[PDB]
Amino acid sequence: EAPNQALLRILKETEFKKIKVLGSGAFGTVYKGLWIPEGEKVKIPVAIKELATSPKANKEILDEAYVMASVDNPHVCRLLGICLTSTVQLIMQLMPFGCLLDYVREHKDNIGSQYLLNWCVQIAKGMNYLEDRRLVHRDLAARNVLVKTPQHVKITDFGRAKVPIKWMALESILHRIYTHQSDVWSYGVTVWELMTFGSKPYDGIPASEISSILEKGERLPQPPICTIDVYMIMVKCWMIDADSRPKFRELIIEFSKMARDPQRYLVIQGDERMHLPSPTDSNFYEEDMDDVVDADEYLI
Numbered sequence: 468e469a470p471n472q473a474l475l476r477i478l479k480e481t482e483f484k485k486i487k488v489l490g491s492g493a494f495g496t497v498y499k500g501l502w503i504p505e506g507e508k509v510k511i512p513v514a515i516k517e518l519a520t521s522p523k524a525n526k527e528i529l530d531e532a533y534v535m536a537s538v539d540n541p542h543v544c545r546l547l548g549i550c551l552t553s554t555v556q557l558i559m560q561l562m563p564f565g566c567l568l569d570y571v572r573e574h575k576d577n578i579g580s581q582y583l584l585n586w587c588v589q590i591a592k593g594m595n596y597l598e599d600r601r602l603v604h605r606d607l608a609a610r611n612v613l614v615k616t617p618q619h620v621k622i623t624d625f626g627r628a629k630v631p632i633k634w635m636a637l638e639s640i641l642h643r644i645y646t647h648q649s650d651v652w653s654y655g656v657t658v659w660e661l662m663t664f665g666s667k668p669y670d671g672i673p674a675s676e677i678s679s680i681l682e683k684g685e686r687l688p689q690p691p692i693c694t695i696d697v698y699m700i701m702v703k704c705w706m707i708d709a710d711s712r713p714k715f716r717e718l719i720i721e722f723s724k725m726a727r728d729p730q731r732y733l734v735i736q737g738d739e740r741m742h743l744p745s746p747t748d749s750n751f752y753e754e755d756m757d758d759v760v761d762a763d764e765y766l767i
């Protein structure tokens with residue numbers, strides 16, 4: 468097939484600074500940072516992901532670097548570059564509001580129908596782009612959707628892009644079969660996570676029981692804010708037959724139609740009166756805020 472002419476940018480350790488720690492987990496440790504390239508007179512807010520140095524861990528991070536440098540879409544997280552230290556670190560775009568999962572949990576009282584439906588449209592767009600680029604995500608979840616601004620979200624975590632059982636299609640659990648249609652199942656679960664304001668899917672149920680539960684016909688419940696219209700979509704993503712599930716291009720269409728009249732498709736008490744931060748807010752954007760540009764506007 469087509470040759471991957473993507474550019475792997477090698478960045479000098481001296482070109483960027485680590486400010487603080489954003490989070491630590493299974494992935495490793497992510498730092499808030501700033502990138503001041505050569506003599507460009509720009510400051511790019513960055514996120515620095517770093518891994519003991521072992522040949523296997525370096526291979527896995529470089530396998531993720533490959534995939535992340537090969538994407539370019541407004542609703543997908545691109546790799547800005549890599550730094551070849553003893554540790555070896557990925558330089559990514561700063562998504563100041565963190566993951567969508569923690570965002571919906573922390574801001575449920577100010578999250579309205581317009582926001583939820585727009586996020587659904589955005590995730591479907593990024594997913595449809597990954598399909599166009601013939602990339603199967605294999606780990607789509609609300610935890611792997613990051614927030615640039617409350618009105619702009621992007622898909623991340625390409626560590627599995629080529630086990631999260633409670634987000635997996637039945638074929639994936641039973642036969643380790645992963646398709647773009649299996650990503651659609653994970654999409655349905657991600658939507659459920661948003662519509663419930665960050666609830667844990669199949670909470671208290673052990674992962675070993677999931678396979679049997681889905682085989683019987685059991686699915687995630689209808690969230691209280693969901694009309695049958697939205698839940699029907701979620702259910703369609705969870706069909707046994709992968710071809711019967713909606714395509715991401717249809718999900719963009721479906722959620723966009725709904726996003727044009729959000730109160731007809733999501734019932735939230737206090738809707739419209741709710742408001743989240745915007746670039747039209749006072750002090751929305753620590754040291755020198757003079758020459759700072761977002762990575763989406765920094766293009767060499």
Ligand SMILES: Cc1nc2cnc(Nc3ccnc(NCC(C)(C)C(N)=O)n3)cc2n1C(C)C
Nearest residue numbers: 489490494497514544559560561562565623624
């Ligand atoms: C609290 C917080 N603030 C952030 C600001 N910016 C990023 N930037 C990016 C950009 C692309 N990819 C990632 N990595 C997400 C990981 C791999 C940590 C994941 N599995 O969620 N972070 C990540 C941030 N977080 C956590 C998800 C670690």
